[PDB]
Amino acid sequence: SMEQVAMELRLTELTRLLRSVLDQLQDKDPARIFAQPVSLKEVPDYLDHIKHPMDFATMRKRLEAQGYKNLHEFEEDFDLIIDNCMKYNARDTVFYRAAVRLRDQGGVVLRQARREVDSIG
């Protein structure tokens, strides 16, 4: 049906809009602390601590597989990255300070991103 084609043209354009946003969020991690999943080789106990790991490359596989149905699903993955980090790592660490910074700065990008989704449907 053509009515499925209109759905896919609107998913494509969410997916293209989320592409921008992820790039903007990931520029706020210039150290690349969050670029890749935490290495299970290097941190074998990691899943004892964190049950739903998340990082930027993983969010990007799922973005180019058109796997984010709405903005809320995208925003959840982003908050996982931040929240896992702030549990796993102590307050006086480069890692925890980098998540605090990314949260704070990402809040601006996400607060405009909400409005553009609502605006353009």
Side-chain angles (χ1 to χ4, degrees), residues 1-2 4-6 8 11-15 17-40 42-60 62-68 70-110 112-119 121:
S1 66
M2 196 91 179
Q4 305 306 303
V5 172
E8 297 146 41
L11 183 59
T12 293
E13 290 293 289
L14 171 62
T15 300
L17 187 144
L18 289 186
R19 200 171 303 119
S20 165
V21 178
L22 190 58
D23 299 337
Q24 293 180 65
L25 296 169
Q26 179 155 28
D27 291 342
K28 309 311 176 149
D29 174 34
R32 294 191 73 89
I33 289 158
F34 303 109
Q36 296 292 323
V38 170
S39 166
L40 303 200
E42 296 169 15
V43 186
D45 70 0
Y46 188 70
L47 303 182
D48 298 342
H49 297 273
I50 292 291
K51 299 298 172 180
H52 302 101
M54 195 39 53
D55 66 92
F56 292 126
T58 302
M59 283 187 74
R60 194 172 306 284
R62 183 174 162 168
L63 184 62
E64 300 300 343
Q66 286 183 349
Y68 288 112
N70 53 72
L71 173 73
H72 183 82
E73 286 184 350
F74 184 76
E75 268 191 321
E76 284 195 348
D77 275 351
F78 180 60
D79 285 333
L80 278 187
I81 307 184
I82 290 302
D83 289 339
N84 288 345
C85 187
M86 295 169 70
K87 293 172 195 76
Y88 185 77
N89 304 100
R91 201 146 49 242
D92 65 340
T93 65
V94 71
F95 305 101
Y96 181 119
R97 291 176 182 272
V100 162
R101 289 170 63 83
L102 169 61
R103 184 196 57 200
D104 285 13
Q105 299 198 283
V108 185
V109 173
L110 287 167
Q112 194 61 28
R114 162 52 65 197
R115 300 191 67 95
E116 291 179 340
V117 168
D118 293 13
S119 173

